[PDB]
PDB file of C-alpha atoms and ligand atoms in Angstrom:
ATOM      1  CA  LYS E  19      79.854   2.085  54.493  1.00 45.02           C
ATOM      2  CA  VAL E  20      82.583   0.299  54.240  1.00 45.92           C
ATOM      3  CA  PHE E  21      84.568   0.198  57.587  1.00 43.87           C
ATOM      4  CA  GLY E  22      88.158   0.826  57.896  1.00 44.59           C
ATOM      5  CA  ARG E  23      89.864  -2.774  60.035  1.00 45.29           C
ATOM      6  CA  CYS E  24      90.464  -0.546  63.255  1.00 46.80           C
ATOM      7  CA  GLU E  25      87.242   1.424  63.085  1.00 45.27           C
ATOM      8  CA  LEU E  26      85.229  -1.677  63.116  1.00 44.65           C
ATOM      9  CA  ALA E  27      87.355  -2.921  65.542  1.00 47.13           C
ATOM     10  CA  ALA E  28      86.308   0.070  67.594  1.00 47.60           C
ATOM     11  CA  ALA E  29      82.677   0.133  66.507  1.00 46.54           C
ATOM     12  CA  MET E  30      82.391  -3.314  67.757  1.00 47.81           C
ATOM     13  CA  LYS E  31      84.052  -2.932  70.709  1.00 47.75           C
ATOM     14  CA  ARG E  32      81.691   0.002  71.791  1.00 48.09           C
ATOM     15  CA  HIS E  33      78.840  -2.235  71.260  1.00 47.93           C
ATOM     16  CA  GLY E  34      79.836  -5.134  73.455  1.00 47.43           C
ATOM     17  CA  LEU E  35      80.985  -7.644  70.745  1.00 47.29           C
ATOM     18  CA  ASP E  36      84.913  -8.110  72.617  1.00 49.21           C
ATOM     19  CA  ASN E  37      84.946 -11.115  74.357  1.00 51.71           C
ATOM     20  CA  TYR E  38      81.390 -11.510  73.780  1.00 51.30           C
ATOM     21  CA  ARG E  39      80.540 -15.767  74.735  1.00 51.29           C
ATOM     22  CA  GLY E  40      84.800 -16.101  74.552  1.00 50.62           C
ATOM     23  CA  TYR E  41      85.191 -14.644  71.195  1.00 49.78           C
ATOM     24  CA  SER E  42      87.673 -11.856  71.164  1.00 50.16           C
ATOM     25  CA  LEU E  43      87.581  -8.976  69.055  1.00 51.41           C
ATOM     26  CA  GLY E  44      89.466 -10.380  66.236  1.00 46.91           C
ATOM     27  CA  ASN E  45      87.724 -13.328  65.958  1.00 45.24           C
ATOM     28  CA  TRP E  46      84.885 -10.849  64.860  1.00 42.74           C
ATOM     29  CA  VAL E  47      86.812  -8.465  62.427  1.00 40.91           C
ATOM     30  CA  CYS E  48      88.286 -11.535  60.832  1.00 41.81           C
ATOM     31  CA  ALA E  49      84.213 -12.490  60.385  1.00 40.88           C
ATOM     32  CA  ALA E  50      83.511  -9.297  59.030  1.00 42.81           C
ATOM     33  CA  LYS E  51      86.501  -9.260  56.529  1.00 48.58           C
ATOM     34  CA  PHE E  52      85.583 -12.350  54.863  1.00 50.74           C
ATOM     35  CA  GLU E  53      81.864 -11.863  55.164  1.00 47.92           C
ATOM     36  CA  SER E  54      81.759  -8.801  54.023  1.00 48.59           C
ATOM     37  CA  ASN E  55      85.099  -6.745  53.353  1.00 46.15           C
ATOM     38  CA  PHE E  56      83.781  -4.711  56.113  1.00 46.29           C
ATOM     39  CA  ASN E  57      81.113  -3.569  53.226  1.00 47.87           C
ATOM     40  CA  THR E  58      77.503  -2.484  55.742  1.00 47.46           C
ATOM     41  CA  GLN E  59      75.420  -2.855  52.040  1.00 47.55           C
ATOM     42  CA  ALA E  60      76.904  -6.351  51.187  1.00 46.23           C
ATOM     43  CA  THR E  61      74.230  -8.607  50.153  1.00 47.65           C
ATOM     44  CA  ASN E  62      74.564 -12.066  48.753  1.00 45.99           C
ATOM     45  CA  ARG E  63      71.733 -14.549  47.517  1.00 45.68           C
ATOM     46  CA  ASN E  64      72.116 -18.032  48.695  1.00 43.24           C
ATOM     47  CA  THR E  65      70.877 -21.237  46.955  1.00 45.60           C
ATOM     48  CA  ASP E  66      68.216 -21.889  49.028  1.00 45.77           C
ATOM     49  CA  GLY E  67      66.596 -18.504  47.661  1.00 50.91           C
ATOM     50  CA  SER E  68      67.456 -16.863  51.318  1.00 48.18           C
ATOM     51  CA  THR E  69      69.801 -13.917  51.797  1.00 46.49           C
ATOM     52  CA  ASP E  70      72.924 -12.478  53.294  1.00 48.34           C
ATOM     53  CA  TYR E  71      72.977  -9.178  55.002  1.00 48.00           C
ATOM     54  CA  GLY E  72      75.646  -6.577  56.077  1.00 50.09           C
ATOM     55  CA  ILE E  73      79.085  -6.819  57.528  1.00 50.12           C
ATOM     56  CA  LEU E  74      78.038 -10.242  59.347  1.00 51.42           C
ATOM     57  CA  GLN E  75      76.304 -11.596  56.026  1.00 52.37           C
ATOM     58  CA  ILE E  76      73.338 -12.447  58.305  1.00 52.44           C
ATOM     59  CA  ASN E  77      70.913 -14.880  56.986  1.00 51.14           C
ATOM     60  CA  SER E  78      67.092 -14.133  56.262  1.00 53.40           C
ATOM     61  CA  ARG E  79      66.138 -17.963  56.889  1.00 51.40           C
ATOM     62  CA  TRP E  80      66.581 -17.498  60.628  1.00 53.29           C
ATOM     63  CA  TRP E  81      67.496 -13.885  61.919  1.00 52.91           C
ATOM     64  CA  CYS E  82      65.480 -11.122  60.005  1.00 55.11           C
ATOM     65  CA  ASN E  83      62.370 -10.571  57.640  1.00 53.15           C
ATOM     66  CA  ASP E  84      62.837  -9.959  54.237  1.00 49.66           C
ATOM     67  CA  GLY E  85      59.478 -10.949  52.892  1.00 47.83           C
ATOM     68  CA  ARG E  86      61.181 -13.013  50.188  1.00 45.78           C
ATOM     69  CA  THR E  87      62.456 -16.183  52.464  1.00 48.73           C
ATOM     70  CA  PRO E  88      59.457 -18.718  52.281  1.00 49.10           C
ATOM     71  CA  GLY E  89      59.026 -20.710  55.734  1.00 49.46           C
ATOM     72  CA  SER E  90      61.627 -18.319  57.371  1.00 47.99           C
ATOM     73  CA  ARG E  91      61.604 -16.896  60.992  1.00 47.54           C
ATOM     74  CA  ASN E  92      63.003 -13.409  62.125  1.00 51.40           C
ATOM     75  CA  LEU E  93      64.572 -14.463  65.423  1.00 48.18           C
ATOM     76  CA  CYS E  94      66.421 -11.302  65.671  1.00 48.11           C
ATOM     77  CA  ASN E  95      62.872  -9.124  64.997  1.00 48.52           C
ATOM     78  CA  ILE E  96      64.386  -6.816  62.640  1.00 45.60           C
ATOM     79  CA  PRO E  97      63.983  -6.130  58.650  1.00 46.71           C
ATOM     80  CA  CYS E  98      67.034  -7.197  56.834  1.00 44.34           C
ATOM     81  CA  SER E  99      67.455  -3.854  55.755  1.00 43.97           C
ATOM     82  CA  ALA E 100      68.434  -2.497  59.066  1.00 43.96           C
ATOM     83  CA  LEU E 101      71.768  -4.495  58.648  1.00 45.55           C
ATOM     84  CA  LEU E 102      72.759  -2.607  55.562  1.00 47.15           C
ATOM     85  CA  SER E 103      73.057   0.445  58.088  1.00 46.64           C
ATOM     86  CA  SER E 104      76.156   2.537  58.619  1.00 45.96           C
ATOM     87  CA  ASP E 105      75.394   2.343  61.936  1.00 48.04           C
ATOM     88  CA  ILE E 106      76.264  -1.710  63.191  1.00 46.25           C
ATOM     89  CA  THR E 107      73.948  -1.173  66.087  1.00 42.02           C
ATOM     90  CA  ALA E 108      71.729  -4.110  64.633  1.00 44.04           C
ATOM     91  CA  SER E 109      74.017  -6.595  63.008  1.00 43.83           C
ATOM     92  CA  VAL E 110      75.682  -6.577  66.652  1.00 46.38           C
ATOM     93  CA  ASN E 111      72.632  -7.057  68.403  1.00 46.11           C
ATOM     94  CA  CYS E 112      71.562  -9.849  66.480  1.00 46.13           C
ATOM     95  CA  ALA E 113      74.970 -11.553  65.959  1.00 44.04           C
ATOM     96  CA  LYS E 114      75.174 -12.230  69.587  1.00 46.31           C
ATOM     97  CA  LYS E 115      72.303 -14.016  69.657  1.00 49.74           C
ATOM     98  CA  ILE E 116      73.467 -16.140  66.468  1.00 50.98           C
ATOM     99  CA  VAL E 117      76.603 -16.685  68.330  1.00 52.70           C
ATOM    100  CA  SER E 118      74.472 -17.630  71.518  1.00 53.47           C
ATOM    101  CA  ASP E 119      72.592 -20.403  69.548  1.00 52.21           C
ATOM    102  CA  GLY E 120      74.668 -23.509  70.060  1.00 52.78           C
ATOM    103  CA  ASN E 121      77.274 -23.653  67.301  1.00 53.53           C
ATOM    104  CA  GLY E 122      79.284 -20.443  68.590  1.00 51.64           C
ATOM    105  CA  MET E 123      81.308 -18.569  65.919  1.00 48.87           C
ATOM    106  CA  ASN E 124      80.775 -21.675  63.505  1.00 48.73           C
ATOM    107  CA  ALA E 125      76.949 -20.045  62.616  1.00 47.18           C
ATOM    108  CA  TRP E 126      79.429 -18.148  60.258  1.00 42.85           C
ATOM    109  CA  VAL E 127      80.823 -20.808  57.813  1.00 44.70           C
ATOM    110  CA  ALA E 128      83.714 -18.180  56.173  1.00 43.92           C
ATOM    111  CA  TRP E 129      84.607 -17.807  59.913  1.00 42.82           C
ATOM    112  CA  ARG E 130      85.428 -21.790  60.584  1.00 43.74           C
ATOM    113  CA  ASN E 131      87.273 -21.984  56.974  1.00 46.23           C
ATOM    114  CA  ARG E 132      89.304 -18.810  57.307  1.00 42.95           C
ATOM    115  CA  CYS E 133      89.406 -17.177  60.910  1.00 42.56           C
ATOM    116  CA  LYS E 134      88.835 -20.545  63.396  1.00 44.32           C
ATOM    117  CA  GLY E 135      92.338 -21.623  64.785  1.00 44.21           C
ATOM    118  CA  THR E 136      94.222 -18.959  62.900  1.00 42.57           C
ATOM    119  CA  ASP E 137      96.116 -15.629  64.925  1.00 42.96           C
ATOM    120  CA  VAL E 138      93.022 -13.518  65.089  1.00 40.91           C
ATOM    121  CA  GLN E 139      95.067 -11.050  67.189  1.00 37.25           C
ATOM    122  CA  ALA E 140      96.685  -9.879  63.745  1.00 35.52           C
ATOM    123  CA  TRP E 141      93.064  -7.891  62.892  1.00 32.88           C
ATOM    124  CA  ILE E 142      93.201  -5.776  65.499  1.00 31.37           C
ATOM    125  CA  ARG E 143      97.008  -5.349  66.108  1.00 32.06           C
ATOM    126  CA  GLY E 144      97.639  -1.886  65.718  1.00 32.47           C
ATOM    127  CA  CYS E 145      94.833  -0.208  66.462  1.00 33.61           C
ATOM    128  CA  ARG E 146      94.024   2.102  69.463  1.00 36.54           C
ATOM    129  CA  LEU E 147      91.182   0.513  71.782  1.00 36.15           C
TER     130      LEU E 147
HETATM  131 CL1   CL I 201      91.891  -4.946  56.051  1.00 37.57          CL
HETATM  132 CL1   CL I 202      89.078  -9.099  73.003  1.00 41.31          CL
HETATM  133 CL1   CL I 203      92.201 -10.748  69.262  1.00 39.14          CL
HETATM  134 CL1   CL I 204      59.538 -14.028  54.329  1.00 38.10          CL
HETATM  135 CL1   CL I 205      59.885 -15.532  64.146  1.00 39.12          CL
HETATM  136 CL1   CL I 206      60.074  -6.171  59.037  1.00 40.44          CL
HETATM  137 CL1   CL I 207      78.405   1.652  64.152  1.00 42.39          CL
HETATM  138 CL1   CL I 208      81.431 -21.349  71.869  1.00 39.27          CL
HETATM  139 NA1   NA I 209      63.353 -14.304  57.345  1.00 43.18          NA
END
């Protein structure tokens, strides 16, 4: 599923992500924009052999099981395929664990490089929320 901008903002808010760990909704929409262009089916291989999955490009080295990432963990206790669903529940629940891990949203390199410090409220501007 390819979400619209305000559609994803509303789904993220319904699943409790708005101001989760102090990160406003626009931070989450901005990260999803540059991780996946709002496409739940996005996948991307990493040089280390792990793979990133879903709207927030959650990585198989630590967070989900895909059966082909040697030495990895599955700390969200989910198959990585669950992160590609049109229903964003699994991605949101796992992102809550990731953002709580110690470094906040810097866990998402693209958030640090393209969202951090910017006018992230622009990503939810105009949306009925
Ligand atoms: Cl957009
Ligand atoms: Cl918010
Ligand atoms: Cl915001
Ligand atoms: Cl594995
Ligand atoms: Cl594990
Ligand atoms: Cl599994
Ligand atoms: Cl959803
Ligand atoms: Cl933080
Ligand atoms: Na894994």
